[PDB]
Amino acid sequence: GEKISGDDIRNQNVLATMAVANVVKSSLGPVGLDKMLVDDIGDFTVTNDGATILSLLDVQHPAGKILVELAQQQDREIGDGTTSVVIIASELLKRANELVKNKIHPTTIITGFRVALREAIRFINEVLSTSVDTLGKETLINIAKTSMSSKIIGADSDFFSNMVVDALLAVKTQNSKGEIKYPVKAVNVLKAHGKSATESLLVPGYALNCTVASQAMPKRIAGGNVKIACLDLNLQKAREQLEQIRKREAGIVLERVKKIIDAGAQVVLTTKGIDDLCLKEFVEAKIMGVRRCKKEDLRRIARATGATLVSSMSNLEGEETFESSYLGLCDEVVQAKFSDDECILIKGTSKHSSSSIILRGANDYSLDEMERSLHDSLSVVKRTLESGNVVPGGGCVEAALNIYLDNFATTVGSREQLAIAEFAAALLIIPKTLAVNAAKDSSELVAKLRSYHAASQMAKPEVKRRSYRNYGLDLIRGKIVDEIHAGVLEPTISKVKSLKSALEACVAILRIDTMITVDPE
Amino acid sequence: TGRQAQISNITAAKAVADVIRTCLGPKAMLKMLLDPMGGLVLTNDGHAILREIDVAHPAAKSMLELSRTQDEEVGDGTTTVIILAGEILAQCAPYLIEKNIHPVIIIQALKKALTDALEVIKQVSKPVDVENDAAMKKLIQASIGTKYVIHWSEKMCELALDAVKTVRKDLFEIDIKRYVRVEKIPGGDVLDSRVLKGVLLTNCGLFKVEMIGDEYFSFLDNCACTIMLRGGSKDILNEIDRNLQDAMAVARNVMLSPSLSPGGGATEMAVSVKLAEKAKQLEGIQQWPYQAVADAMECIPRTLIQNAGGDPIRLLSQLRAKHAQGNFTTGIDGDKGKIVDMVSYGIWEPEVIKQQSVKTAIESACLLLRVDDIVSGVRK
Amino acid sequence: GQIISNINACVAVQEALKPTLGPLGSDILIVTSNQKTTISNDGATILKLLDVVHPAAKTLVDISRAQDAEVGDGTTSVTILAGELMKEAKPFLEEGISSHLIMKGYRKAVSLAVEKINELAVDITSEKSSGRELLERCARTAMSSKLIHNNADFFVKMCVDAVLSLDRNDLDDKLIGIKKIPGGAMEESLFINGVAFKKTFSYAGFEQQPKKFNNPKILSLNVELELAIVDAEWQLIFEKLRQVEETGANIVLSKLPIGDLATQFFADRNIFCAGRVSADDMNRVIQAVGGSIQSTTSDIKPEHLGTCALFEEMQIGSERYNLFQGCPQAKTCTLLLRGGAEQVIAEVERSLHDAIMIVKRALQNKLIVAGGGATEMEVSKCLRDYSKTIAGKQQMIINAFAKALEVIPRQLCENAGFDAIEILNKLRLAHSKGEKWYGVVFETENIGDNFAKFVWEPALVKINALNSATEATNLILSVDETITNK
Amino acid sequence: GQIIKSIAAIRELHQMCLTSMGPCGRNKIIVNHLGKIIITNDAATMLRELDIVHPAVKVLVMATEQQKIDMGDGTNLVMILAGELLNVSEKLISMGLSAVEIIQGYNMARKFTLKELDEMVVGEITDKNDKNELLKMIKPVISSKKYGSEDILSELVSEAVSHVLPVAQQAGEIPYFNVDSIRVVKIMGGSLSNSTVIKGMVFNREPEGHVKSLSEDKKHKVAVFTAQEMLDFSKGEEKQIDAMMKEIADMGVECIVAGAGVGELALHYLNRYGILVLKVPSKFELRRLCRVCGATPLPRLGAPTPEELGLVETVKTMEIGGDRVTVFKQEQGEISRTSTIILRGATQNNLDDIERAIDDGVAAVKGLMKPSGGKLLPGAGATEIELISRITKYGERTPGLLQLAIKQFAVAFEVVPRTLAETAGLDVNEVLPNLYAAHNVTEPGAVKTDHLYKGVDIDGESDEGVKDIREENIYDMLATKKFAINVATEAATTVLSIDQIIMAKK
């Protein structure tokens, strides 16, 4: 079919790249703005998340879809910074275009970026810091403020700081051959409206959204040794031989409930609704029935309370029974009204302890953004506790590393130093884009910040304390502030994997030479 | 695209707000709609207008969910609050697309505007005791003036005020008033009602069963209240619930906010003149977008002038001078477009009416400013 | 935004002149509606015949036309700098940087550049090179920096001896005009000490013309000589011929042609006469022989008749021309080009006229600096250290102008086939740890010292180059809109 | 069909002249049907060469003639002010306000502005002949006119005005100011440092026959003027021309001025008798020649009257810009005023902007001499911020419908400080609070506080925003501002008065 080769394809690759790059430019930084997407189904979705946009984004260019899969891999590896990482592919491929039109060979561009990022780890070793960082009184709050970038939660992040920290405090467990980590992605988030952001409650346990059929049951259980059972089977009314089968099936249901009553389970979790036959057995046995449960939420209950889901009741023989090993354990069961509904609160579980988060917002479009923003912050603390090395935030990292690459280019020399200079100018778009979203001047703070880092490497003792060297930048007032007063920092694993995952991503665009379009059937 | 995409979003809410300008007050006008199917809907309520119309502008679709939130609280007179969200968008034309003002700077100015607005709301605060049945009677009759059930409300609104106080009481005073069960009986006279205190199905007085074509009568003595309504026509029961069941918001708002504000669009008159005075003390970059909010506040009372057939330029000259000099209790007569103050006008509205109006307006206005552009064709 | 669209159309102007930089440069062929073939390296003739679309293209033409007064040569290495300053300034114009900071920062960079150029220019005088040396040894490669590579050795021993007769403080460009003689050789051109012009018309006594004069006298007369009516018209012309003989003029220059009566009268007396004399040739004789032009025979007097040492009739290219020698006042030496190719005559015509500009500025001040594009490298090296502390954002602005001067060594490597990166690494150490004067050497194809290479260039070329590129680049930034009626 | 249509053309031209004014201002290129390229920042010259197909917006085009005749400067300020008044009035039109109160609002505020100009005036200092006073007037023009070099151009004009100065110290009551007394010549090539001033006037012509000086003659004399039968006319003219040219040489007249067609026989005798002649003098050169020299252009071809003749103390025909040129150069002692200033530049378009800048400098002296005085006003946009506080106060003093017109009249003043920020690329919102920081809440008890004393000068001080205008000598012309608000109000109300376009037989 259509076959077109030459340098026009690489010029078209960056043209389609810069076209979709404008999507994440306005959403970068705490002051970034959201954008509305039309789903053509009558509704719309307003999101600044690059992972959600690139998924729905329609790209008619074959190479433009590579950036879509790049954000998907960064969600499992990192889980945050979607618009603060992928955005570099705009100018990085644009500066390489000037080298393609010149006599620079693509391998020099490829090997130039590899030697730059390989030796960049030693440059990062200067800005690293331990997990203790300052004198304390703020520990996981400083890393919780990392999610302020690219998101609008920075205004309400004051009260939400202690909510995220305390949610991951009691979920501690032992895994990874004895390593102590927090099993994230297991936190339940409930959507609610009313009051304000400061009224958000943190539940140190499991929260279930359902409706209790009979209010006369022991809704609130006082004391320990609470047994909870889980059954995937549906016990209800279901299909003169028709009346005889109805009586035989009713006896089978009452027999299976009798096995649960004999086990002493205080809470019975069912997938579907409960008929009137099972409700009469629960009141006499002082058991609270639960209906309309989601299978995905029941999987976390099996790990938390310790109640394994029962697919079917059977054994090696033809006897049906419910074993006692499928019962869960917790400290107490408390039921309170949460947002025009009564939810079950399971706290103090035996096997594993979980946590639930209740959020408040304006509308459903606001809660969708507030949920994913705080959900991505859970991975920020998780990835930070894995590697104690941390780097300061504020965009001062990209401006500082580009100065060391200037003398590093003179060390290597030859033709590989020109690609290093172009790679240093490519990283300068990150601090300049933040100035555009902050309605400030671009080169104003960039030229000044690089002046403090220019003499940073020239200081022999570090003369007295730090006259020039410092970290952090103030986007609101457009001034250079210290990282201690600003209180902003970012994890190292997020910054290293940023350019590391983008390494093979940008080169893949450069490796494209001949473009061929086959006509569809 | 970019700033050009926001211009289409401002005109989207501006075109919708201009339709509901005449939907406020007892003089409110009506609007006729023509669908591609050929059906016509003529009504003065903007609730069914936004639901039936399918707009091609993605920004106007967000106002449909906002109307559901405003109608969940009161629903009568709160539909025109969307105009305030549309006037702010049109107010940014000399700033956003001309001075290149950053949206967050405007949003930050709206945060100080929403905070200063609540202070002005507390300035017009006029508490009143809820123990007086005559004072609460004229309060629920405020929204009745837009209907012909005014003289019918004598035997109607008295049943609603007595039933809410039974299910309200205290706890704060927060309680659930949804336990009430209202039964509607078609046919008969509207003057015929049923006074029943108890649960409809110790030392009970009497037990009897009446004769009704719908169902029988049963009394349950407790140690909860129901309402049996007999309509004066067949389909009149739809309008009866709007003047009684939907009127329960007045009884809920007086318990949460006993204070009273000028009714009939007379509240924001003292707010606009006070907001301009609070702007002179700011003395900053944000002063211009902050002071320009008062220009959007005076557009709401112009709807009454457009309904009264007056000149909004010349009439508001003397009207704004009364609120900024004489007192903040002055108001505007919506019927004839007169300077008669709210003191002799006899109608007062709770503060929460304007609180939830401004709160939902600022929260909806900033979200529209946070949208850079709109794209289509994703094929989800 | 409107300036960017105007720059891209002006980029192709010097990109067509891109290979033309350096002595290895190429030429541009131009064919007009008259089918006149013009092949020359100089962009002044190129931009004059180049079709312009946007008015910004005329800006480079006005600077190129004024370049003859400021410098006159090296136009390939000057005009290209006007487009390079606006090429790297595109990312700055797209950002919040205004074009005023680029224009204001440019004058601050030129003020520091000219200060260093005057520092690089050193005048020893004293016992070092003097006349006939600086104009030969140091001007060997300085006179022609582009063309005449094979014939350079011929003109150093010829053209230098012609410009030696030109004394300082005079610098007359009216007497340096050349002529076009078909046929012959370039190195065989004869030196002419007096006025020489073409006959342009053939005579029946062309072979009978007098060979030489011992004491010739040139007289300029505008009287038209052309023939009862027959006796009257013949007598009036005869009386005018007798009045001319009273002055004793052996050479009579007539503006309008003469008939047979005036020719036969002058042939019998062995009196020379030449018709169809142009007005430009008459002013050349006034500044050489010192005669005068008489309109009629009323005011003609014997003292208006000038004289010269001797006259000679030269025959070259199968055609004879008038040759004057030993004029009373001659400030230059007339040169006559030769060769059979018309393009070659016009090729060296632009080059020799550009070489006299060096002699003009050398007599005022004698100065030489390192040539071969090494001047901008030392200036760009100094601007990198100063601009860091100068007025905030001006660091990145001057560094853009510092990197804009890097186009000169990149162009010299494009023609020679070298590497653009390899020369920058060698010069960076040569202009920092290697002090200054180390340049680039094309002959040995490596980096060497221009002091021992004998190749130098006047620093006055680079001084006016920045001034010529000042208002040229500032006008592009100062114009944000262009309107064309109809 | 008119308002919205005109504003579309107004916002176009208003944005065009917005970047013209100011030291950071920009120029434009205009190409006519003949291909002539002109680069200038002047709005009057701009709209003159441009072809506009919208008759409604042409009101602002013809309104420039009122400003050029009265003053000739501040043309960019009038187009920005008049264009902004119609832009801010668009909001009042959408509100339903009739043009009655809009026209009355601008006319009521116009009289209030004239009352403030007399109260806010400073820096009398009243000195005509000081060389520093000539520098204080010519320096501020770098905003509207060419800002390229104010050091050299200010010195040449100050020496030229002082050279043509009538003197007559104390009270001389000097009428008949000479606008033509200043002339510049465009010379291609060279830099501005090569430019100088000559005590006499110069012009571009070339000598032919003599080129000799002849000014060493110690009060020389100059005159000014307004088949045998075939030789009867030939010999008849040779005898008459010889006798007429001999009597002129007998009187000792070295140079003559011939304003008519000169034949070949006339130039023949001029070379023998050594008499210089001028070739085809133009209309404006003929008037300047007879007034300065004081000789009568006698049309008679014979001997002129020796009693009345021209005189030039010192004149040289040698090279000036590299070519021999005969000029009128003279000395103030024995002959009258109207000297010249020679300019040197590589670009001919830059010499045109300097010519228009110097021509506007002549009006600065006209504004001082013709009325009682030109006074002074705060420059660099510092005058408009002083009026904003005054006009805002008048809105509360006069309650009524004019408050809507007074409000938009004060907001329209924001374009002047925005001009400095827009042309410099800086954010106007950052400089805006620095402009209000001068007056703060109210004015301090001291006289001439930082509001009146200082001003807005942005070079490295953009962070501070305020700078002293006294040391910088940045001021605005009072006669220009009085005429600016008059033309802007007359042009704004004219557009609002337009009803329908009428075409008659076309």
From Swiss-Prot, chain A:
It is found in: Cytoplasm. Changing G32E: Temperature-sensitive. GO terms for cellular component: chaperonin-containing T-complex; plasma membrane. Keywords: Acetylation, ATP-binding, Chaperone, Cytoplasm, Nucleotide-binding. CDD domains: TCP1_alpha. Pfam families: Cpn60_TCP1 (PF00118). GO terms for molecular function: ATP binding; ATP hydrolysis activity; ATP-dependent protein folding chaperone; unfolded protein binding. The keyword Isomerase does not apply. Gene3D superfamilies: GroEL (3.50.7.10), GroEL-like equatorial domain (1.10.560.10), TCP-1-like chaperonin intermediate domain (3.30.260.10). GO terms for biological process: chaperone mediated protein folding independent of cofactor; protein folding. InterPro entries: Chap_CCT_alpha, Chaperone_TCP-1, Chaperonin_TCP-1_CS, Cpn60/GroEL/TCP-1, GroEL-like_apical_dom_sf, GROEL-like_equatorial_sf, TCP-1-like_intermed_sf, TCP-1_chaperonin. Its main location: cytoplasm. The keyword Chaperone applies. PANTHER family: CHAPERONIN. Molecular chaperone; assists the folding of proteins upon ATP hydrolysis. Known to play a role, in vitro, in the folding of actin and tubulin. In yeast may play a role in mitotic spindle formation. Belongs to the TCP-1 chaperonin family. Heterooligomeric complex of about 850 to 900 kDa that forms two stacked rings, 12 to 16 nm in diameter. This is T-complex protein 1 subunit alpha. It comes from Saccharomyces cerevisiae (strain ATCC 204508 / S288c) (Baker's yeast).
UniProtKB/Swiss-Prot annotation, chain B:
GO terms for molecular function: ATP binding; ATP hydrolysis activity; ATP-dependent protein folding chaperone; unfolded protein binding. GO terms for cellular component: chaperonin-containing T-complex. It comes from the Eukaryota. Disulfide bonds join C223-C225. Keywords: Acetylation, ATP-binding, Chaperone, Cytoplasm, Disulfide bond, Nucleotide-binding, Phosphoprotein. It comes from Saccharomyces cerevisiae (strain ATCC 204508 / S288c). Transmembrane segments: none annotated. The keyword Chaperone applies. The gene is CCT3. This is T-complex protein 1 subunit gamma.
Curated annotation (Swiss-Prot), chain C:
Signal peptide: none annotated. The keyword Nucleotide-binding applies. Pfam families: Cpn60_TCP1. SUPFAM superfamilies: GroEL apical domain-like, GroEL equatorial domain-like, GroEL-intermediate domain like. It is found in: Cytoplasm. Keywords: ATP-binding, Chaperone, Cytoplasm, Nucleotide-binding. InterPro entries: Chap_CCT_eta (IPR012720), Chaperone_TCP-1 (IPR017998), Chaperonin_TCP-1_CS (IPR002194), Cpn60/GroEL/TCP-1 (IPR002423), GroEL-like_apical_dom_sf (IPR027409), GROEL-like_equatorial_sf (IPR027413), TCP-1-like_intermed_sf (IPR027410), TCP-1_chaperonin (IPR053374). GO terms for molecular function: ATP binding; ATP hydrolysis activity; ATP-dependent protein folding chaperone; unfolded protein binding. GO terms for biological process: chaperone mediated protein folding independent of cofactor; protein folding. It comes from the Eukaryota. PROSITE patterns: TCP1_2, TCP1_3. One of its GO terms (cellular component) is chaperonin-containing T-complex. Belongs to the TCP-1 chaperonin family. Heterooligomeric complex of about 850 to 900 kDa that forms two stacked rings, 12 to 16 nm in diameter. PANTHER family: CHAPERONIN (PTHR11353). Molecular chaperone; assists the folding of proteins upon ATP hydrolysis. Known to play a role, in vitro, in the folding of actin and tubulin. In yeast may play a role in mitotic spindle formation. This is T-complex protein 1 subunit eta. The lineage of its organism: Eukaryota, Fungi, Dikarya, Ascomycota, Saccharomycotina. The gene is CCT7.
Swiss-Prot record, chain D:
The gene is CCT8. PANTHER family: CHAPERONIN. GO terms for molecular function: ATP binding; ATP hydrolysis activity; ATP-dependent protein folding chaperone; unfolded protein binding. The keyword Cell membrane does not apply. It holds the Pfam family Cpn60_TCP1. It is found in: Cytoplasm. Keywords: ATP-binding, Chaperone, Cytoplasm, Isopeptide bond, Nucleotide-binding, Phosphoprotein, Ubl conjugation. The modification Phosphoserine is found at S462. Belongs to the TCP-1 chaperonin family. GO terms for cellular component: chaperonin-containing T-complex; cytoplasm. It comes from the Eukaryota. This is T-complex protein 1 subunit theta. SUPFAM superfamilies: GroEL apical domain-like, GroEL equatorial domain-like, GroEL-intermediate domain like. Heterooligomeric complex of about 850 to 900 kDa that forms two stacked rings, 12 to 16 nm in diameter. CDD domains: TCP1_theta (cd03341). InterPro entries: Chap_CCT_theta, Chaperone_TCP-1, Chaperonin_TCP-1_CS, Cpn60/GroEL/TCP-1, GroEL-like_apical_dom_sf, GROEL-like_equatorial_sf, TCP-1-like_intermed_sf. GO terms for biological process: chaperone mediated protein folding independent of cofactor; protein folding. Molecular chaperone; assists the folding of proteins upon ATP hydrolysis. Known to play a role, in vitro, in the folding of actin and tubulin. In yeast may play a role in mitotic spindle formation.
